């Protein structure tokens, strides 16, 4: 038999299965093949189109095809055009989502097939899904690279650009998931999904630098990408890769993202570990289940409650459905990886489960279900019983997506095509070719990092230049580089904003967002003039820590490390550094010489750098082109001066020279009169700005902080810190110690956070805003560069840490009065924070160490699992601080490693007022866990009162102290706190004695 018979048989299969139910009006397939359903998804139609394209590509190899390929290309083009028309029909939603993303402004994903219009309201389906858009973009670029034509005019280019802009920010907004359910509880909450992030990253890589018009194109078919969004997506994927979600340990949806559709996991060892874990934990006789405890269309499921009630998931286990479609994906992975044995084993496994039509055509049923007479018997013996085929397995109902995957897998197995043909973009490469690819691996190899970064030195003034030259320092004035121009960061942002504007539909272009260091590291050409920019660290900032040279040394070193680690473009990056005459300021001129001499040496902390004339570096280098533009102590107290008249306050302000009194008088005037009042030096706002700038120049820190609080200025980097803290798994709470506090569990817009923190600041204190900002930036920087330092802490509270270093500084002061923290330099504040953050050692009083540990809310490693095992072996429960933790709901709702059980435990334990008491309670709980685990014969007879145990231990310690040191009964347990837990007579001994006393009775 020749190829003709096989291709004809595949043609009959496709005609009788796939293309039979295509809608001529729109060209998109529906979800149901019977009953005249008017609903359609996006995934199934796209998969069918991809299968048709693959079949046409296979059939192309015959010069006498008799037009078979033409029909399939035309059907695929019609489907793509219909989907593009449906997407572009809704235009207001895209613009709304570009500014304030939300489920209300989300793009609709389900619509009627007959007229391409919406049919069902967004309150019953969510409509929030970004995987479909990314997959559509990837398939579209793949088809265009293949040689097909789908884009007609330039408006489609603008629409694609806006779609890329909207999808660039998918790493923060939670999605509804592939299965549309999201959380396992199915209550109506959105969470982050790793598969969506991976698909978005893959599409971002694919769409970068590609001609959308095909064979011909000059300047109106290219797409521009931002490296910062790709970097952030990569970080989020890497952080959230081991676990698909916080509420899902594993899921079968992780397969089409680390396989042929995506091919995004380039880690080998971790990819293999994840594959083994998924195979071990989700393997089934009849296929692969969606996930554990999945009550999806099971026998016990009823069509009367969209949201599952609590504790129903516990009853829903053991009857999970089986989906044999994943066998095709596994076989595709096997043939792609060149492992025939896996292909044979999965083919033999899939052979019996396959069904046949009247003519014997293969059938792939959707899901498998168990009859109601084996509900309980199956629980005792998993998989020993037999299931029953679904409705779409005999006649009248089919599964287009499953059949398309089956025919694709069979075509791949039959060797009718090659992996290169199906992957014209080369998404997957083997280990020996990962040497000179773009955006993925460097030219030095995967397991190598020796990048050399170019550094350019530019002076600021002629006097500063000659002063540096007198010491041997070579710098060039900006007036001697006349052919080259140096622009700030705002110009590039404005130029990017001018791009992507359309008048027919109404387009706002790229949103006004700051550009990262990697973006500024390149060289641009605007209107035929070369444009270079320096990082945002060098520009003047109203804040105060920019005047400390140690902070500048640290941040330039961190920027150099960031450039070294995350640079993959061809060509060496360009770095620009500027030195200002006001920086040296006399005595502060030596360490600048030190850093610059180290830079001239060639190595900066293990990072190699190069210095030369800027013109030499510019010549012979690739320059980015932007061609769109042409086409288009105080003596004044608050209480004393509050009731003074306006004229007296004005006179006092006029005739006073002290900065603090001037600031407090300006604040009183602003609070009483208002910002629009006129004083001797212009408007109130202008006077406040002038005095703030003068304070910054004089660098007296308390007045600068007061003026910054007055100006209501906030840093533009809090959102990355809060989002990386959330993705890490920790929690942050904003507030003041001893006052109200706000807890954040999901990413929020900057406006809401700013309003909340400013309202709190207006409520309690004056300068806590800037102190909190400095603390959060320092903590974020430290956790970014030293993640292991913050191990053991879950809830990060700035106010408690502030109280912590205040107490430590007061202790250090001793007889000398404690120094005010508002007057501390940024270097001193950073040193204090790093000192308190240290794991702590002996020498100092153990009470202070316990206080610091409790303030930081540190928890021992393995505390959560120990608590869970205690709760499993505690028939009654655990009661602390008046809170109750019943065993039945937590056992019937949560699981071993679920994070919400840990959250409930933390909420229960957070009612303790004394942090040292909390630490002692935690140590006692650990001792109880260890003792109970070491011996299973002894079990508790009733609920334990840990307060009673602590009181008994305290009384025993009091008796022992009276016996030894003849000390009378003293109130408070601070003596117990001072005693170390281990030693000759530690706290652990008393806790063990209390434990044995409780167990014996």
């Amino acid at each position: 038999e020749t190829l003709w018979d096989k291709l004809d048989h595949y043609y009959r299969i496709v005609k009788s299965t796939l293309l039979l139910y295509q809608s001529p009006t729109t060209g998109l397939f529906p979800t149901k093949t019977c009953g005249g359903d008017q609903k359609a998804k996006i995934q199934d139609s796209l998969y069918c189109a991809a299968g048709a394209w693959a079949l046409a590509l296979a059939y192309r190899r015959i010069d006498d095809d008799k037009g078979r390929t033409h029909e399939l290309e035309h059907s695929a083009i019609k489907c793509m055009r219909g989907i593009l028309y449906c997407y572009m029909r809704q235009a207001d939603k895209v613009q709304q989502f570009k500014q304030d993303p939300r489920p209300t402004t989300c793009l609709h994903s389900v619509f009627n097939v007959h007229t391409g219009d919406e049919l069902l309201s967004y309150e019953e389906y969510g409509h929030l899904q970004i995987n479909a858009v990314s997959l559509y973009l990837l398939y579209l670029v793949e088809m265009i690279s293949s040689g097909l034509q789908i884009i007609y005019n330039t408006d489609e280019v603008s629409f694609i650009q806006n779609l890329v802009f909207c999808v660039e920010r998918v790493y923060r907004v939670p999605d509804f998931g592939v299965w549309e359910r999201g959380s396992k509880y199915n209550n109506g909450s959105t969470e982050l999904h790793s598969s969506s992030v991976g698909l978005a990253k893959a599409a971002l890589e694919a769409i970068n630098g590609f001609n959308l018009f095909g064979n011909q194109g000059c300047s109106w078919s290219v797409i521009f990408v931002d490296l910062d969004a790709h970097n952030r997506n990569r970080q989020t994927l890497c952080s959230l890769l081991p676990r698909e979600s916080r509420s899902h340990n594993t899921d079968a949806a992780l397969l089409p993202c680390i396989s042929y559709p995506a091919f995004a996991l380039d880690d080998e060892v971790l990819f293999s570990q994840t594959l083994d874990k998924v195979v071990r934990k989700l393997k089934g006789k009849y296929g692969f289940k969606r996930f554990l405890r999945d009550g999806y269309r099971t026998s016990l499921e009823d069509p009367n409650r969209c949201y599952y009630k609590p504790a129903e998931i516990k009853l829903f286990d053991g009857i999970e459905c089986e989906f044999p479609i994943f066998f095709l994906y596994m076989m595709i992975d096997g043939v792609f990886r060149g492992n025939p044995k896996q292909v044979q084993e999965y083919q033999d496994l899939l052979t019996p489960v396959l069904h046949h039509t009247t003519e014997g055509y293969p059938v792939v049923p959707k899901y498998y279900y168990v009859p109601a007479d084996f509900v309980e018997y199956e629980k005792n013996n998993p998989g020993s019983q037999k299931r029953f085929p679904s409705n779409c397995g005999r006649d009248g109902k089919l599964f287009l997506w499953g059949q398309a995957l089956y025919i694709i897998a069979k075509l791949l197995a039959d060797e009718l095509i090659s992996p290169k043909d199906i992957d014209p973009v080369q998404r997957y490469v083997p280990l020996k070719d990962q040497r000179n690819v773009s955006m993925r691996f460097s030219n030095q190899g995967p397991l190598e990092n020796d990048l050399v970064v170019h550094v350019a030195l530019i002076a600021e003034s002629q006097r500063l230049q000659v002063f540096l030259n007198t010491y041997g320092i070579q710098t060039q004035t900006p007036q001697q580089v006349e052919p080259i121009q140096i622009w700030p960061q705002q110009e590039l942002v404005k130029a990017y904003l001018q791009l992507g504007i359309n008048e027919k539909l109404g387009l706002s272009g790229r949103p006004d967002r700051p550009i990262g260091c990697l973006g500024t590291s390149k060289i641009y050409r605007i209107l035929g003039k070369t444009v270079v920019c320096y990082p945002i660290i060098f520009d003047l900032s109203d804040f105060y820590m920019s005047q400390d040279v140690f902070l500048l040394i640290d941040d330039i070193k961190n920027a150099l490390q960031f450039i070294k680690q995350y640079w993959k473009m061809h060509g060496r990056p360009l770095f620009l550094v500027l030195i200002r005459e006001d920086n040296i300021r006399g005595s502060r001129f030596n360490p600048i010489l030190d850093m610059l001499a180290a830079l001239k040496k060639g190595i900066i902390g293990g990072v190699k750098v190069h210095v030369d004339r800027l013109q030499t570096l510019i010549s012979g280098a690739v320059v980015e082109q932007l061609d769109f533009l042409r086409i288009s102590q105080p003596d004044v107290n608050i209480s004393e001066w509050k009731d003074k008249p306006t004229h007296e306050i004005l006179q006092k302000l006029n005739d006073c020279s002290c900065l603090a009194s001037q600031a407090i008088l300006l604040g009183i005037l602003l609070k009483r009169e208002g910002p629009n009042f006129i004083t001797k030096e212009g408007t109130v706002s202008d006077h406040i700005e002038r005095v703030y700038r003068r304070a910054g120049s004089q660098k007296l820190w308390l007045a600068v902080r007061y003026g910054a609080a007055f100006t209501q200025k906030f840093s533009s980097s809090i959102a990355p810190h809060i989002t990386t803290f959330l993705v890490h798994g920790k929690q942050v709470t904003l507030g003041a110690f001893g006052h109200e506090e706000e807890v954040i569990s999901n990413p929020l817009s900057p406006r809401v956070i700013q309003n909340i923190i400013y309202y709190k600041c207006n409520t309690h204190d004056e300068r806590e805003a800037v102190i909190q900002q400095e603390l959060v930036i320092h903590i974020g920087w430290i956790i970014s560069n030293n993640p292991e330092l913050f191990s053991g802490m879950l809830k990060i509270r700035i106010g408690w840490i502030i109280h912590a270093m205040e107490y430590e500084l007061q202790i250090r002061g001793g007889d000398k009065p404690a120094l005010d923290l508002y007057q501390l330099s940024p270097s001193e504040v950073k040193q204090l924070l790093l000192d308190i953050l240290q794991p702590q050692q002996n020498g100092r009083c153990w009470l202070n160490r316990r206080q610091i540990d409790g303030s930081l809310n540190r928890t021992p490693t393995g505390f959560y699992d120990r608590v869970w095992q205690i709760l499993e072996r505690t028939p009654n429960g655990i009661i602390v601080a008046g809170k109750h933790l019943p065993q039945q709901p937590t056992l019937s709702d949560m699981t071993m490693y679920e994070m919400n059980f840990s959250l409930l435990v933390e909420d229960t334990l957070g009612n303790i007022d004394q942090p040292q008491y909390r630490q002692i309670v935690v140590e006692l709980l650990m001792v109880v866990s260890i003792v109970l685990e070491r011996n299973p014969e002894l079990e508790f007879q009733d609920k334990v009162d840990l307060d009673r145990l602590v009181k008994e231990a305290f009384n025993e310690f009091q008796k022992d102290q009276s016996r030894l040191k003849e000390i009378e009964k003293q109130d408070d347990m601070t003596s117990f706190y001072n005693t170390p837990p281990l030693g000759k007579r530690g706290t652990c001994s008393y806790l063990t004695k209390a434990v044995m006393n409780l167990l014996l009775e």
Partner: protein, 241 residues
């Protein structure tokens, strides 16, 4: 645009005036008229026009045709400079002899030949002493090396350039025939010092102080080392006269 039209007109004028007699392979243009010889001085001075045209064309090219034209012009000037260097490097014995003592017999010929780069006259039929030509050639070579046009390939040429630096380093006490090849004021030429040669040599010596010939991708041994006393002596001599 008007700039493109002006550039095309200037390129046409240059092609019709200079480039018609480039004499490929050898790369040396005839020194005008029907004399069939290649003077070094005029041949070096006949290059600034095409070099400036290429430099102006490179910055505004932004197109395949214009970039190709700039490529052609730069490669043409590189060809000519290599042709210049070949004739000088074929006469290492002469410069080696001139390095010790000063005499008219052990000096490089001032008029090289056409194809096969041979000699046309002996050592007693012309005034073969012109330090100005070598000085201006070295200065312009340093300039085009600074712009970014590769002219040097082998390391031995670096040694030859270093030897030539010492060959021209004694111009402040060495008498020459002169730029006009007529000796002193009158005929029957007798060697006599002229300020023009010293001024020519001083800037050439200053230019090659640190400029490496291998571009941005050189090595520890890629630069030419020069002294500073000779520059000061030349400056003093020029100021005096």
């Amino acid at each position: 645009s008007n700039s493109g039209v002006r550039l095309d007109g200037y390129a046409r004028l240059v092609q019709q005036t200079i480039l018609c007699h480039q004499n490929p392979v050898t790369g040396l243009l005839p020194a005008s008229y029907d004399q069939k010889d290649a003077w070094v001085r005029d041949n070096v001075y006949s290059i600034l026009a095409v070099w400036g045209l290429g430099l102006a064309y490179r910055k505004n090219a932004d197109r395949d045709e214009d970039k190709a034209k700039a490529y052609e012009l730069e490669q043409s000037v590189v060809k000519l400079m290599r042709g210049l260097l070949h004739c000088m490097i074929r006469q290492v014995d002469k410069v080696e002899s001139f390095k010790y003592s000063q005499s008219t017999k052990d000096s490089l010929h001032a008029k090289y030949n056409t194809k096969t780069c041979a000699t046309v006259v002996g050592d007693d039929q012309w005034g073969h002493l012109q330090l100005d030509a070598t000085s201006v050639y070295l200065l312009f070579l340093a300039q085009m090396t600074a712009s970014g046009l590769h002219i040097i390939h082998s390391l031995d040429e670096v040694n030859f350039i270093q030897n030539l630096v010492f060959y021209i380093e004694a111009a402040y006490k060495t008498a020459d025939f002169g730029i006009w090849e007529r000796g002193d004021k009158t005929n029957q030429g007798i060697s006599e010092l002229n300020a023009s040669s010293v001024g020519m040599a001083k800037a050439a010596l200053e230019a090659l102080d640190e400029l490496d010939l291998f571009g941005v991708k050189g090595g520890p041994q890629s630069v030419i080392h020069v002294l500073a006393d000779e520059v000061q002596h030349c400056q003093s001599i020029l100021n005096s006269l």
